[PDB]
Design a protein around this ligand. Structure first.
Ligand SMILES: *[C@@H]1O[C@H](CO)[C@@H](O)[C@H](O)[C@H]1NC(C)=O
Ligand SMILES: *[C@@H]1O[C@H](CO)[C@@H](O)[C@H](O)[C@H]1NC(C)=O
Ligand SMILES: *[C@@H]1O[C@H](CO)[C@@H](O)[C@H](O)[C@H]1NC(C)=O
Ligand SMILES: *[C@@H]1O[C@H](CO)[C@@H](O)[C@H](O)[C@H]1NC(C)=O
Lengths: 85, 48, 48
């Protein structure tokens, strides 16, 4: 296992990608899947060590360009929408 | 929603079918989701 | 022990067998050319 990085993975035949972290919520001794409103799996029970892990997609981001017009000067500035510098 | 496909998750269907056979099922999902988005866009256009 | 059986039961008294808790290598099923009809419904042969 490896955590704290956006990785590609498959669990018992289901494929996915994102970052996996330890979970605090208590899982019933028979359930295996955690689902949200949009019907996307987020909680996985490991089949070897019997732990609960939570999957979160890594950073989305957004890029915008501020320009004063190429007719005058050829310089630009960059704006990131949700990136936390 | 299902929209008439075997499964509602793109990765699951993409991981269980031959791509020539899979090309006939993704189209239904694409059409359904596009038609879903258009209505919301139109409603927002009217409300503004 | 299913594909190599000596005698097969009649079609009106068919027998069913349960397979669980093991590992499978389906290659030998679709690698040999002895079979005459081999059809997969809902899944691809290789992806098994
Ligand atoms: C391997 O099987 C044994 C059970 O004897 C146990 O250690 C565990 O369930 C499995 N995984 C690892 C990493 O050992
Ligand atoms: C470009 O910028 C100059 C400087 O103001 C301006 O005179 C001109 O009309 C602009 N457009 C073109 C096509 O040169
Ligand atoms: C943005 O980054 C600063 C510096 O690390 C941090 O103090 C702040 O809490 C962050 N805000 C968000 C919303 O991530
Ligand atoms: C029966 O088993 C033998 C070896 O175990 C194998 O070579 C043969 O193909 C099998 N018969 C089938 C699959 O019809």
């Amino acid at each position: 296992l490896v955590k704290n990085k956006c990785v590609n993975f498959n669990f018992n035949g289901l494929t996915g990608t994102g970052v996996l972290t330890e979970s605090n919520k208590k899982f019933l001794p028979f359930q295996q899947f955690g689902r949200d409103i949009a019907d996307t799996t987020d909680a996985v029970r490991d089949p070897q060590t019997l732990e609960i892990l939570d999957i979160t997609p890594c950073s989305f981001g957004g890029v915008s360009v501020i320009t004063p017009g190429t007719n005058t000067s050829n310089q630009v500035a960059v704006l990131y929408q949700d990136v936390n510098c | 929603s299902n929209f008439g496909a075997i499964s509602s998750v793109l990765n699951d269907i993409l991981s269980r079918l031959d791509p020539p056979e899979a090309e006939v099922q993704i189209d239904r999902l694409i059409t359904g989701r596009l038609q879903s988005l258009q209505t919301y866009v139109t409603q927002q256009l009217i409300r503004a | 022990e299913v594909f190599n059986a000596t005698r097969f039961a009649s079609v009106y008294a068919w027998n069913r067998k349960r397979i669980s808790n093991c590992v499978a290598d389906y290659s030998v099923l679709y690698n040999s050319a002895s079979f005459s009809t081999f059809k997969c419904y809902g899944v691809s042969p290789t992806k098994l």
